[PDB]
Design a protein around this ligand. Structure first.
Ligand SMILES: *[C@@H](O)[C@H](C[C@@H]1CCNC1=O)NC(=O)[C@H](CC1CCCCC1)NC(=O)[C@@H](NC(=O)OCc1ccccc1)[C@@H](C)OC(C)(C)C
Length: 306
């Protein structure tokens, strides 16, 4: 039946995107109820970017220093505050499209959908994972600040990311919806670089289970392994150490395929040591680590091929 890196339908989120301008800077904002959220760096000027003092720069502005536009309608800002690295703009109107939602701080290794926006207008949607080094490999251009990352459960949108900047390696950094950065990054244009990253072991294992659920067992073997013996091989290939908690999480998938977690680890250990041998898994020539065990169960069918 196939396996794709699919994102959540973006509708509920599109109806919350607005444009926010201050000075000569324009970026996207998130409009929920009667509040608009956006990167606080929107109040910076070319010279302020290197070493800005936001509390100082902010006190120097008023409600009308901010221009908030929803579609082709201007929104009147009647208050403002700073929450960590975000600005909280109160508007005279409550967003009619506000969906049931909540703010969540995603954890490393987890995935979410990003709705790339420009000038308050949604341009695209794609899935990505929060890297262990706290960055994401997105696709953002100037003007994308304010674009958000999210997950959806039933009809509740869990916002978990707002975009703020790009690092030298072409990767991206941002904050949760409370304005707290993911990683040791700060909103200042002083030299910063992503730390060394690692492969998300739990996800690679989840992805292998998905492959089995979809029909092939070519990579499996007759061996098994000690959690400890696996981790020695993990360090060598720069994979995150596997823990008992990770083993526990893979429980349901293990049950649906009848393949013991440690046996799959043995299978992975072999793939890392011998390679793909010119063969593919779910269409890939490399081991994918951007699918959580949750993403697999969500997408795949509850019945394995066999
Ligand atoms: C959202 O509009 C943007 C998005 C960037 C632009 C290109 N792709 C993106 O995702 N906002 C920015 O342009 C930010 C804005 C500043 C953030 C801090 C507070 C003041 C405004 N800048 C970046 O995202 C720049 N990143 C960065 O400076 O990082 C620290 C640093 C400084 C010097 C050397 C290494 C690292 C980007 C434009 O610059 C580089 C591509 C050189 C990293």
């Amino acid at each position: 039946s196939g396996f794709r890196k699919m994102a959540f339908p973006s509708g509920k989120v599109e109806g919350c995107m607005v444009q926010v301008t201050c000075g000569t800077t324009t970026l996207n904002g998130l409009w929920l109820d009667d509040t608009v959220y956006c990167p606080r760096h929107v109040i910076c000027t070319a010279e302020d970017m290197l070493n800005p003092n936001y509390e100082d720069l902010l006190i120097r502005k008023s409600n009308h220093s901010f221009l908030v536009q929803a579609g082709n309608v201007q929104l009147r800002v009647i208050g403002h505050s700073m929450q960590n690295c975000l600005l909280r703009l109160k508007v005279d109107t409550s967003n009619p499209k506000t969906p049931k939602y909540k703010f969540v701080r995603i954890q490393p290794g987890q995935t979410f959908s990003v709705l790339a926006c420009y000038n308050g207008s949604p341009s695209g949607v794609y899935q990505c994972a929060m890297r262990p080094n706290h960055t994401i490999k997105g696709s953002f251009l100037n003007g994308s600040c304010g674009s958000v990352g999210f997950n959806i459960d039933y009809d509740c949108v869990s916002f978990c990311y707002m975009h703020h900047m790009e690092l030298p390696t072409g990767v991206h950094a941002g904050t949760d919806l409370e304005g707290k950065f993911y990683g040791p990054f700060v909103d200042r244009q002083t030299a910063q670089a992503a730390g060394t990253d690692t492969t998300i072991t739990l996800n690679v294992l989840a992805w292998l289970y998905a492959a089995v659920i979809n029909g092939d067992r070519w990579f499996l073997n007759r061996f098994t392994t000690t959690l400890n013996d696996f981790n020695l091989v993990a360090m060598k290939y720069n994979y995150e150490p596997l823990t008992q908690d990770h083993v526990d999480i893979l429980g349901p998938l293990s049950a649906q395929t009848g393949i013991a977690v440690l046996d799959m680890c043995a299978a992975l250990k072999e793939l890392l040591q011998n390679g793909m041998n010119g063969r593919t898994i779910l269409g890939s020539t490399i081991l994918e680590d951007e699918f959580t065990p949750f993403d697999v169960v969500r997408q795949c069918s509850g019945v394995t091929f066999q």
